[PDB]
């Protein structure tokens, strides 16, 4: 049978506020490319071809950009249906909705908005198939996950995962997050279930590439009380007395799938995809034939779009996706950056770890750090910033003005810790 | 003796 993949392009961890004001979450430029693109290239890599995307909040801009998709070409292998429904705000309803129109034939692979991945599901896909039809629907879900180590910057302060699993069929036994739990709690339910070895793990990522089966749309319709996948899995893990038909977990070893959630996660995944950690996917492969993403990979992980006019003596040690249209002056010391298109720079500037974007601009001698910007975001002479110091929506900063850490300024007083300005204070 | 019934019949209304 074909391999169809439900997909929702509004991850309800609505954290990229105020950034979510101008352009929606999913459309975000990570490395001058749509995350949703990364996801779609993934879907094509594992070879699925009938993908059902979904966006409720701000579906307009989604279609606006995705009409010219790498997979919205007539030659594409993937067919897409942006069902522009603005009723649900929890995945529960969209899963009962793919129930409500019998879209998924059978054996689908649901996926959140902006998973960064290179994973070949086919190994999983087939073992799922095996223990689902050589076992006749005793499965409902076969979670896929990716081995890691806790200390990595993939698991930010916010989100980790810890899970009890079996070791014979690798079936899930319990799933739970660990936002500040110096201890944990596992019931002997585990062992009164079976006396042949049980495993606990804290070294799987929040891969969020759940394989599933339309009877998951069943398990969501039959009980209208689930609003997220974790709701699903813990409800089914407690409802094992009857009609559980538990999850058959499975971990990979060689790939990299992360459901980017928070600005720290975006940070980590961007400055790991520049390091080719996911390759095939990296903008010098220009996987979206979209023109201006011609990225002339070069010495020592320095990427370089065409026509960057890099400034004299501007050292750039590593991992600098200088996008198209850029221009740079003398001594501009960039590092780990992502300089999008339309980025004029001054002199003596340092931009360690920064993430500029399109439209951005900056004058001379303007040290920055750990930063982030957005469309026409501007900071003039001798400004300075600090970790997570977002600033978007064309915000400006005046000369001489240092700024503190969380300086998330934007086009709104009430939500940003500043407002659209051309100084520092005074909205 | 003479005090148990006294308490019982003198605190019936006030003490709930």
């Amino acid at each position: 049978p074909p391999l169809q993949a439900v997909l929702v392009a509004d991850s309800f961890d609505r954290r990229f506020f105020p950034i979510s004001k101008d352009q929606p979450r999913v459309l975000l430029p990570l490395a001058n490319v749509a995350l949703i693109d990364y996801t779609l290239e993934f879907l094509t890599a594992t070879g699925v071809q009938e993908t059902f995307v979904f966006c409720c909040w701000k579906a307009a801009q989604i279609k606006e950009h995705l009409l010219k998709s790498k997979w919205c070409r007539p030659t594409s292998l993937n067919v897409v249906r942006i069902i522009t429904s603005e009723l649900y705000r929890s995945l529960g309803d969209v899963l009962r909705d793919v129930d409500a129109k019998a879209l998924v034939r059978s054996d689908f692979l649901l996926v959140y908005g902006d998973v960064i991945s290179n994973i070949n599901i086919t190994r999983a896909l087939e073992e799922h198939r095996l223990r689902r039809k050589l076992e006749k629907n005793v499965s409902v879900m076969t979670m896929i996950f990716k081995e890691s180590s806790p200390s990595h910057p993939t698991r930010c302060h916010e989100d980790n995962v810890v899970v009890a699993v079996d070791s014979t069929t690798n079936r899930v036994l319990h799933f739970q997050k660990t936002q500040g739990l110096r201890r944990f709690a596992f019931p002997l339910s585990l062992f009164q279930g079976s006396s042949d070895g049980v495993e606990v793990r804290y070294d799987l990522l929040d891969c969020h590439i759940s394989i599933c089966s339309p009877q998951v749309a069943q398990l969501f319709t039959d009980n209208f009380d689930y609003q997220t996948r974790d709701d699903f899995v813990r409800g089914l893990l407690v409802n094992e007395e009857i009609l559980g038909n538990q999850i058959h977990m499975h971990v990979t070893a060689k790939e990299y799938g992360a459901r980017v959630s928070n600005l720290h996660m975006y940070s980590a995944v961007c400055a790991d995809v520049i390091r080719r950690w996911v390759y095939p996917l990296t903008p010098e492969a220009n996987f979206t034939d979209s023109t201006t993403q011609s990225c002339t990979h070069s010495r020592h992980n320095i990427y370089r779009g065409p026509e960057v006019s890099l400034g004299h003596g501007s050292i750039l040690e590593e991992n600098v996706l200088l996008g198209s249209g850029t221009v740079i002056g003398s001594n501009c010391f960039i590092t780990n950056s992502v300089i999008g298109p339309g980025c004029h720079i001054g002199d003596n500037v340092v931009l360690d770890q920064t993430y500029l974007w399109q439209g951005v601009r900056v004058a001379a001698g303007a040290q920055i750090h750990q930063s982030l910007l957005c469309d026409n975001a501007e900071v003039k002479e001798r400004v300075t910033l600090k970790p997570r110091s977002v600033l978007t929506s064309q915000v400006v900063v005046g000369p001489n003005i240092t700024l503190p850490e969380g300086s998330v300024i934007s086009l709104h007083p009430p939500d940003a810790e500043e407002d659209e300005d051309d100084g520092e204070f005074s909205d | 003796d003479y005090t148990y019934e006294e308490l019982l019949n003198r605190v019936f209304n006030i003490m709930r």
Binding site: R183, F184, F186, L188, L190, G197, V200 | -
Partner: protein, 343 residues
């Protein structure tokens, strides 16, 4: 040397084979001249002469008091313990080549060790050497509490409810001392070891080094279990029935018997072991069970799965079924029922 085969054994090496003596025997096979063997002095001296009844030129006998818990008797014998001890429990009947556990110990400077053949769910490491948790359902009701620290350091844990440990603990002198000041810690197996593992986390830290086993075990309340042992025992008796007045006509099926024993006519034995120097010589049959001596046997013992210990008798009309022979059986005919009965 660096050890002492101190044996925490209380309470007899029954059968056709000196069972209780066998932990000694086996450690004796691999060096370990010294064997501290605590005895039973809750009434009288009923255990030491029983060791004078044995054949190891280097054994030692230790009297005791009313009640001696494991760590209690540890603290008791503590002074004469002047090395890294090697404690050991009563019913070691297990062909484990002990070189593996002391191997692991001598390797990773282990503050402890133990064994586990295949209550008491445990968490063992990925590599299966540095265990990380032990408990039982008695300890706590249901919640497998594991302090997030260790999962934040030791990444992947396998579990084990399918275990039969053998209470064998290679130690280190300073842990014996750490116990000697801990007057309240009564028993090693129940409280000490889990306390130490609890204190594994707040290289000069401590260690715990378990081991999975699939060869043999430690006997408990069902001693008919070690009939398994009996069936297997003769293999242990390769160079370390076997010698008796045999009949070669009566049923011999995985049997065991000592010399100068019940040799008569018209008997049988099916898949079990026997006693030594008792009265079983009349018209008899198998009992698929084991017996101790001094139990006069006669008239076709149609029994199955029981014990005929001392203080028993039967003659000329006897028949039984899974009814153990305890004390107070001056019997000659008592048709028994296979349910729980010890007459």
């Amino acid at each position: 040397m660096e050890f002492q085969a101190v044996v925490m054994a209380v309470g007899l090496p029954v059968g056709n084979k000196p069972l209780i003596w066998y932990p000694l025997n086996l450690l004796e096979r691999v060096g370990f001249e010294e064997v501290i063997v605590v005895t039973t002095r809750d009434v009288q001296k009923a255990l030491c002469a029983e060791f004078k009844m044995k054949m190891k030129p280097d054994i030692v006998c230790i009297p005791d008091d009313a009640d001696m818990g494991t760590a209690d008797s540890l603290r008791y014998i503590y002074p004469k313990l002047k090395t890294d001890v090697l404690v050991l429990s009563c019913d070691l009947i297990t062909d484990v080549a002990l070189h593996e556990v002391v191997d692991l110990f001598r390797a990773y400077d282990a503050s402890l060790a133990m064994l586990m053949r295949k209550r008491d769910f445990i968490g063992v490491d990925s590599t299966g050497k540095r265990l990380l948790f032990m408990a039982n359902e008695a300890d706590l009701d249901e919640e497998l509490v594991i302090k997030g620290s260790i999962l934040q350091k030791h990444p992947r844990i396998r579990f084990h409810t399918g275990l039969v440990d053998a209470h064998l603990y290679c130690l280190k002198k300073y842990i014996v001392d750490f116990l000697m000041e801990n007057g309240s810690i009564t028993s090693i197996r129940s409280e000490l070891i889990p306390y130490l593992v609890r204190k594994q986390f707040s290289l000069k830290s401590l260690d715990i080094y378990s081991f999975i086993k699939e060869a043999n075990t430690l006997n408990l309340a069902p001693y008919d279990a070690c009939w398994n042992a009996c069936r297997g025992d003769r293999w242990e008796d390769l160079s370390r029935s076997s010698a008796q007045i045999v009949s070669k006509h009566l049923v011999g099926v995985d049997s065991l018997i000592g010399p100068e024993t019940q040799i008569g006519e018209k008997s049988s034995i099916k898949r079990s072991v026997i006693g030594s120097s008792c009265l079983i010589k009349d018209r008899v049959t198998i009992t698929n069970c084991l017996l101790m001596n001094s139990v006069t046997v006669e008239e076709g013992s149609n029994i199955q799965g029981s014990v005929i210990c001392n203080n028993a008798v039967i003659e000329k009309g006897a028949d039984i079924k899974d009814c153990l022979i305890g004390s107070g059986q001056r019997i000659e005919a008592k048709a028994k029922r296979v349910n729980e009965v010890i007459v």
